[PDB]
Amino acid sequence: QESVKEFLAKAKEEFLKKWESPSQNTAQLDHFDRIKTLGTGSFGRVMLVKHKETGNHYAMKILDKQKVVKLKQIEHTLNEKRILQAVNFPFLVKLEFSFKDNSNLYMVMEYVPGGEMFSHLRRIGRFSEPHARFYAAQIVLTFEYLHSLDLIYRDLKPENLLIDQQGYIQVTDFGFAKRVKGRTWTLCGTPEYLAPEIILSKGYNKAVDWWALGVLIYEMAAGYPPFFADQPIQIYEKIVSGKVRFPSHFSSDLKDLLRNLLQVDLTKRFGNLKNGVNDIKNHKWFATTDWIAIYQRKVEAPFIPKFKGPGDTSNFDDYEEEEIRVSINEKCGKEFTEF
């Protein structure tokens, strides 16, 4: 109890220190051999790379500065890198290097070979409740840590959770993570995971992360999210209604948890009440969960991804391998000065 307060106070001191003086320019492009494209997005790519000196494998996120500026992502991009170099928690991906050149921004992260939770869930269909609870406990601890830093995460979904070689979760995306001691107003996220107050143009706070946790737990346990429809507007209408149905195989404890996380009235939502995160940690569905052992990663994971060594990429899709071009002309120098 007093141990937790002391740990989080130490953690916030370390975070703010790195936040105020970020690291910059800790490698360069020709230190790395490119191996395979792991993901492609509207502003960049993620590639498996091999550090030439050590042979260590990494995931290198490459962002085209001109596309980032075109798509109005300057603040999110700078913010993500600033978050990543400053946070420190077992279920958060580690930033190893970052640098920029004339054309691109580069974030070099530890390579998580097991791929996205998303693929595993869609492959297997749904997770049993013990399996789902194992992942859920990690998100709960991660949110407790981030919320202690006044960070709202806002981007939870199986697409954004990787499974490491121990079977534990690594959170990767922090563009939308905002420092919010009070309230904030941006409509952002993924429709299936949006809390009703984000849809409803009201100010909102970190309670939206506990709603999204409810969506995630439901999806992991059911194989599909609680609110879906052909078009996002119809998902929004279902979300703001207080109506949700559960598969008949959901346990009683699970439904009671979900009714308290998927609580439209944010003054009755678990995580947002007087006892904060402890209402979740002490809920009956988590009765078997050893919170400290989860944090220390001493719990036997329910699923271990198949990894035929370092640099195996079988848990990622195949993409068209395009050149990495670096222009003769410096692009967007002033906008990315702090990166």
């Binding site: 998303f118 429709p191 194989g223 879906f228």
Partner: peptide, 18 residues
């Protein structure tokens, strides 16, 4: 079934941000 409705929704793949 609900799963059938999920499939019919077309939102079974990776979901982009808004």
């Amino acid at each position: 079934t609900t799963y059938a409705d999920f499939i019919a929704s077309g939102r079974t793949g990776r979901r982009n941000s808004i």
